[PDB]
Design a protein around this ligand. Structure first.
Ligand SMILES: CC[C@@H](C(=O)O)C(=O)SCCNC(=O)/C=C/NC(=O)[C@H](O)C(C)(C)COP(=O)(O)OP(=O)(O)OC[C@H]1O[C@@H](n2cnc3c(N)ncnc32)[C@H](O)[C@@H]1OP(=O)(O)O
Ligand SMILES: NC(=O)C1=CN([C@@H]2O[C@H](COP(=O)(O)OP(=O)(O)OC[C@H]3O[C@@H](n4cnc5c(N)ncnc54)[C@H](OP(=O)(O)O)[C@@H]3O)[C@@H](O)[C@H]2O)C=CC1
Ligand SMILES: NC(=O)C1=CN([C@@H]2O[C@H](COP(=O)(O)OP(=O)(O)OC[C@H]3O[C@@H](n4cnc5c(N)ncnc54)[C@H](OP(=O)(O)O)[C@@H]3O)[C@@H](O)[C@H]2O)C=CC1
Ligand SMILES: NC(=O)C1=CN([C@@H]2O[C@H](COP(=O)(O)OP(=O)(O)OC[C@H]3O[C@@H](n4cnc5c(N)ncnc54)[C@H](OP(=O)(O)O)[C@@H]3O)[C@@H](O)[C@H]2O)C=CC1
Ligand SMILES: NC(=O)C1=CN([C@@H]2O[C@H](COP(=O)(O)OP(=O)(O)OC[C@H]3O[C@@H](n4cnc5c(N)ncnc54)[C@H](OP(=O)(O)O)[C@@H]3O)[C@@H](O)[C@H]2O)C=CC1
Lengths: 446, 447, 445, 448
């Protein structure tokens, strides 16, 4: 196999750039895919009852043609993200609609408009080829990838690339994602691999760490400062496992919300002290399908004040959506910020605008991160200031079970996936820095 | 009263010096529009609509209050009747006497406001007569208007933007000695210089809705308007929206004005706007039923906006109607744009589709009234002739009851003013050249 | 002649995109060029004595090959600015040095490394062909260009592309510039042509306009708001003339500084009213080569207050540098901003920091403009809020004389160049908006 | 030592006086204070600033109590500190403070109380409220307080969106009278903050001025707006401002590059948690080659040394205050897009820099000055929470304030130099012993 020869080169440890440039490309690669003819297979079911194991296929797919500004990457490991779940249950809409619309832009984007969709929005691996116009990256470079896909032909994105009208998420709104043995990315998605981490560890921060960085740290989100109090929903999940770290390292005080004593213990291991278990408290923010209960908003606010000495939070880190959003707006301090990048429990938000306008609060929408933000987030991992939060690793063939874990909220931290890597534990080339941080690196491990 | 008449004579002469005002003997009573503590339940049982301010508002002669540190006594030439004045006059949401009594427990200074009568009114235009201890920047004779937000600023919270202060009082509503009277008492950090090209009644008009619109649309605490922006303005001929339309035009931006009648569209054209949507003629139905919205109506509004902008979506939505329009407001905003909100007239339980907010990196910014720097800047743009008052009708002080009913029942398209000491309309202009340049717009809301 | 038929299509006014796509390309185009062998010809001379008429050639050159994300444009008009003049006299160094070094990177970048250099960093014209991947532009589109190109391989420029470490000015650090019948640009340099302007007027605002927009209007510079008072140095020059217009269009008050009565008249024709003639006032901000005179800073401040009713300016629009900068910091209001994008009179600035910290002022550096700011500035021209400042137009064959005119500061406004356009005055397709603004459009004629 | 003053101190020291007990104490008719005299403001004319001796101009006087006004408090001062503005005052540089008092005195009959032939100095205090004026409801006799030094009238609209912008804004004890280097002081009640209970009187007095300033300059959005990951060049990292700036950089998750002039100060920086330390004396930087011209080669040498510590990165922020000597280098070494934030010019206020580095690299120079009440509250809250620690090195008696000021004038100190006012000895005033115990090693990091 051409693919076995590629893996052997990576595992040897002493292949030069010219060696990678000399390997023959395989004619197909193994990939986790959706099929277009199945996009209605879950019609009539409740979201909970839609099973990613039924929709996710392991296929052999042809290599796409390499274009200008792009790189072909040999993927050692990837991760399950919530967009992998959304894709796999075809909610809110089918990703094939996104691929069809993308394919209308040009003959190059039309490569993506296929009857199958290779998923995955994270990777760690090795560059094999680069297209025309690519100088910064070369075959053999060890990389991780962020998932922003921007074309930058329009002027709109030249003062923050998230504002590009053609901005997409790689592996979700584009094809050739990371849950596969090979991937195709733009080279402006590439970042240097953290040397003290294994392949699966290095693949795990990309998406959620970059998003948490823009949403909480950067001036394009909440602009955290030391001394702030920050309410962090889902503090032991993917986003929250990085948000909590940024709050603590930035000198702020996180109030972490989780739903089990096991996750509460992890938050204490990260260094948080103020932890609310929403299951034990039994919050019912909605009385029925159409009306909320302000008494329950107020009970949450009172519990926060027990931890802060009577202070309300400067920032709410939102993402659960409809269930929690009325409470989030209510409990925020006068002049404070609710920053939101998601709506897991439902995107039709309801809130009492009297609390927003009379208290001069703001709701800031945030979405992934631009390259500069993704670089800064990955830099803090490489410096050993922010740590990966991997809890469990699955084989590529078992990506469906990994997606079901997240779908049903059975996990903590990040769930990783081995792609070409034959086992866990490979890829560390800075053992001294790894040993300095190993206890924190393994804090989420089962 | 002889002393009061001599004060008015000094003002009307046009050439009294500061020393002359300092030498005028103060009156020992002044005429004022008041509520009476004994009557606060006279409307119990009735619907808001059927409560009549002519039955609760009294014309009384009241004694002058003692002038404290950092305060000014003002001879009032004109004032205004706004929604806060109307609600007070019908003891809604609760009687104003409740707060005057509680706050009056703090100190002998706060207890001056706790009286069996309440002098209403949160606007004035007039002349400073006396200042209390420590005052530097104002002197007898200075011609002034007032910002009605009073802050004590003992908490640190308000020292980077005073709207964050936790202890605000609206003068004439949560304080006594308001402006619907011949004299008023205010803090000197409420005073603003009178625009010289306007009459007394015009200068008292812009008031809180003008500074609120300025903070919401122009200032960096709100939307931070820049030239070239497209701005969707709901209620563009009402209080807030009329000033927002003017700020958009004055700042080099394009307002897309929304109104509900052809008469209102004509007022918008008179202010200088060109892109006008009649929401009633278009028949928008943003809610399908009590609990669900219709995204195809959001998109129909979006397509109508694009007809005026050459295919562009708005950088800013100037919100205030609330529940009925808020879903559409979030939908139509450009990627990276801002929805600024300072009220919820149609209902405060907002519902919107958050996918549009996070996937297009939009933000919803809450704003409320204005701090004193914003009020100074808004008033300064009126004084420069960039922003014009919106007066429709003027009443004498003796007829404040009817003025209040007119506002309560929405009888006029623009503001209702009240003459206090001024004997007739049309006095107080000392810059006729500037007035002549802007006369048509100044009178756009007169019939 | 294939070139003649391209011009006839443009002049017909009703060719469709399919008609442009069907036209045969010419094998060569007429271009204004420098020659590699002559780069030492002005060795020994003072700058003022170098004559661009001796170095600029009119050549027929072959068409370059069209790469990914590029467009081939038929050029109706161009401009001559200071970058063009500097290149034509090989200052500060010959432009061929950078073209050679950059052309080592790849076959794409080596297209630019030729023995001749086609100059010009402005255009107005019609798209003829686009390279692969191009979505937003098609044959027939009427365009102007933003001259600053970025590669954006580094993350640094992905929150504001001016932070990118590898910028190139098209026609100066690239070949195939706009002083020619055809040009090659990236598609993320293209902007829609303002319909109410002639070809030569549309090509004129260019980089000084977008630089002024970034410095004064955008949040990356001073963040102007209506009501502000703005001190504008050099108010009838390139930057200052656009800055004056942005101040007015944004509802602010420019306090315009000029050095002659004729310049004051031009400021009044633009709409300004508060004008200071620094030469009539006789300001001497420096007492000698090393020390300033705070009494003269204060004298300027007092003159400003005569126009503002006693207020100090919220913003100073700086660019003269050493001579004026101490005065600029002094006169700015408490909490105000001094924004700077050049140092004409000298880059070693000196100022009294007590005024800066005790009055919480800031000095903000700005440079050129990113593509979003260039689009917004061009859009305000297209709205008729901002007007071009052309003084004189030359034919392409006379580009040498045009460059000498700019080099010796012969005109008060800009110098334009007809490329394919056979005469001035063509290209207006919005005559109603033009008629509204004709007097201001011609203020520098 | 008068009887009424002795009775006030006995009440404080008893630990159990009630608010009504302080209200009932007789006030003294005079108090002991460190003062300047108007007749002497020319005494150093023609001398180089280094040769001006604060021991010659600072007097210990008995002065009459001023009349209490609306919005004010009379405070019994247990301890204060020397600040550099105490040094500036005592050498009448750049100008005499009596010009400031004369100008202030023209505003109103209330501000005219300050226009006196002597100037009571001091811009920090820790102590106990004795009396409050009209309009004061938030503070009462007996409250244990520290004071920040912002004096704002807030009559003008300009200060109502950040009070530092008030046109009449002044620094208490420098541009106003009745400062804190004295047994009693007069302040606006909007200068008052709750005393941190785990600190002694002298420790609690020491952060106010420089900690508030460093917070606005580095942490707040009105200054540099620090974020975790930033590299920050901190001049004078073991002095007053620097000893707080370094703590904010570390606690905010940034990397300070600390500049000091001795190995002893380098060791304190390491004890604070910094690793990247430059000794400007050992490096021998000569940024100026003569009176009128700088040396870009030395700017470059500093920039190269910084890059050795950061792995090749240039600093996002420079925390400036030395002024003329360093400012050209500070602008040069800053990263593209970065910020130089300045609140002072110790070495000379006529700054010179190369504007090509500022405009071509899109840098900005942000002027900062003290802090508004909200920022001062936030800075003091972080001390009270034990997140930021006092940096007191040495304590002098009130009668030795002249020598304390000379220490700072000649750059012989580290951290903050404290002064006992009414407090009879060091070590008093702690009422949270368990929080103190948790943090004691860091609290004492600067002690001789
Ligand atoms: C892990 C990474 C990350 C990720 O993976 O993300 C995440 O985990 S995140 C959570 C997962 N992600 C989601 O959960 C949501 C997926 N995505 C969607 O759910 C839909 O995508 C959305 C609701 C956002 C929009 O859907 P859509 O219905 O497609 O939107 P819209 O209406 O904007 O556009 C269609 C037509 O409306 C026109 N149009 C637009 N604006 C106006 C206007 N103002 N006026 C008039 N017409 C207008 C356009 O011009 C078009 O016209 P056409 O071009 O002729 O079709
Ligand atoms: N815009 C963007 O770019 C990004 C958006 N997202 C979106 O953010 C959301 C979370 O992503 P991720 O963190 O990766 O997923 P995870 O599932 O790993 O973390 C989600 C956490 O949310 C909490 N949670 C779930 N449902 C509720 C609820 N109804 N009420 C309160 N808390 C709840 C759980 O914590 P517990 O049960 O312990 O309280 C869980 O750990 C998803 O919707 C995802 O699509 C993600 C990343 C990028
Ligand atoms: N808290 C306080 O102290 C005060 C609060 N307020 C609040 O501010 C709000 C606005 O103030 P102001 O502008 O002075 O009020 P106005 O009554 O002057 O104008 C309100 C406009 O809102 C528009 N509007 C109302 N309902 C809807 C709707 N359902 N959909 C769309 N547009 C609508 C109408 O415009 P059209 O019909 O022409 O489209 C109406 O003219 C007030 O309604 C009140 O709630 C006001 C003053 C004081
Ligand atoms: N880096 C680059 O690639 C480019 C840099 N630049 C730089 O930008 C600067 C300005 O560009 P532009 O506006 O187009 O130049 P202009 O020549 O068009 O206008 C410059 C104006 O500055 C004013 N000025 C010059 N010297 C002084 C002085 N000592 N004191 C006061 N005012 C002075 C004059 O106005 P008046 O005499 O009327 O008061 C003069 O008109 C150029 O001078 C150059 O340094 C420009 C082009 C490109
Ligand atoms: N605007 C405001 O509100 C405030 C302004 N200031 C001003 O800030 C400055 C410092 O205040 P503070 O920190 O209290 O004083 P300190 O003397 O305690 O600290 C100053 C430090 O600067 C360093 N330093 C002194 N001179 C030079 C020089 N020429 N070059 C380089 N480094 C130098 C020394 O460190 P080393 O020798 O170890 O390098 C010294 O420790 C003063 O000018 C003061 O007035 C202070 C506080 C508030």
């Amino acid at each position: 196999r051409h693919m076995q020869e590629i893996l052997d080169a990576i595992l040897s440890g002493d292949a030069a750039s010219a060696d990678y440039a000399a390997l023959a490309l395989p004619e197909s690669y193994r990939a986790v895919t959706l099929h277009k003819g199945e996009e209605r297979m879950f019609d009539g079911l409740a979201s909970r009852d839609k099973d990613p194991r039924k929709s996710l296929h392991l296929d052999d797919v042809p290599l796409p043609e390499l274009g200008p500004g792009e790189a072909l990457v040999a993927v050692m490991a990837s991760s399950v993200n919530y967009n992998t779940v959304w894709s796999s249950i075809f909610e809110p809409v089918s990703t094939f609609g996104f691929l069809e619309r993308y394919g209308r832009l040009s003959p190059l984007t039309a490569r993506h408009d296929l009857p199958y969709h290779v998923l995955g929005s994270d990777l760690a691996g090795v560059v094999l080829r680069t297209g025309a116009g690519v100088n910064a990256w070369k075959p053999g470079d060890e990389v991780v990838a962020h998932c922003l896909s921007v074309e930058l032909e329009s002027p709109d994105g030249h003062n923050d690339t998230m504002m590009d009208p053609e901005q997409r998420i790689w592996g979700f709104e584009t094809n050739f994602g990371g849950l596969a043995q090979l991937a195709l990315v733009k080279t402006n998605q590439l970042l240097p691999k953290p040397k003290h981490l294994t392949w699966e560890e290095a693949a795990s921060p990309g998406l959620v760490n970059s998003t948490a960085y823009r949403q909480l740290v950067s001036r394009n989100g909440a602009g955290l400062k030391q001394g702030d109090n920050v309410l962090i929903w889902g503090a032991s999940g993917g986003l929250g496992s990085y948000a909590t770290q940024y709050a603590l390292a930035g000198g702020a005080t996180p109030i972490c919300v989780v739903s089990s004593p096991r996750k509460a213990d992890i938050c204490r291991a990260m260094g948080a002290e103020a932890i609310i278990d929403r299951s034990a408290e039994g919050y019912r923010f909605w009385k029925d399908e159409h009306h909320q209960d302000p008494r329950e908003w107020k009970r949450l606010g009172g519990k926060i004040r027990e931890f802060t000495g009577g202070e309300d939070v400067d920032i709410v880190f939102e993402h659960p959506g409809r269930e929690t959003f009325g409470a989030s707006v209510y409990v925020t301090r006068k002049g404070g910020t609710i920053v939101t990048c998601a709506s897991t429990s439902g995107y039709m938000h309801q809130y009492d605008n009297r609390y927003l306008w009379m208290s001069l609060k703001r709701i800031v929408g945030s979405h992934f991160a631009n390259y500069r933000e993704a670089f800064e987030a990955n830099r803090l991992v490489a410096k050993g200031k922010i740590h990966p939060t991997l809890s469990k690793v699955y084989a590529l063939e078992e990506t469906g079970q990994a997606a079901l874990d997240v779908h049903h909220n059975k996990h903590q931290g990040k769930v990783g996936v081995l792609c070409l890597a034959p086992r866990e534990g490979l890829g560390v080339t800075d053992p001294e820095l790894r040993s300095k941080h190993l206890t924190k690196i393994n804090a989420f491990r089962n």
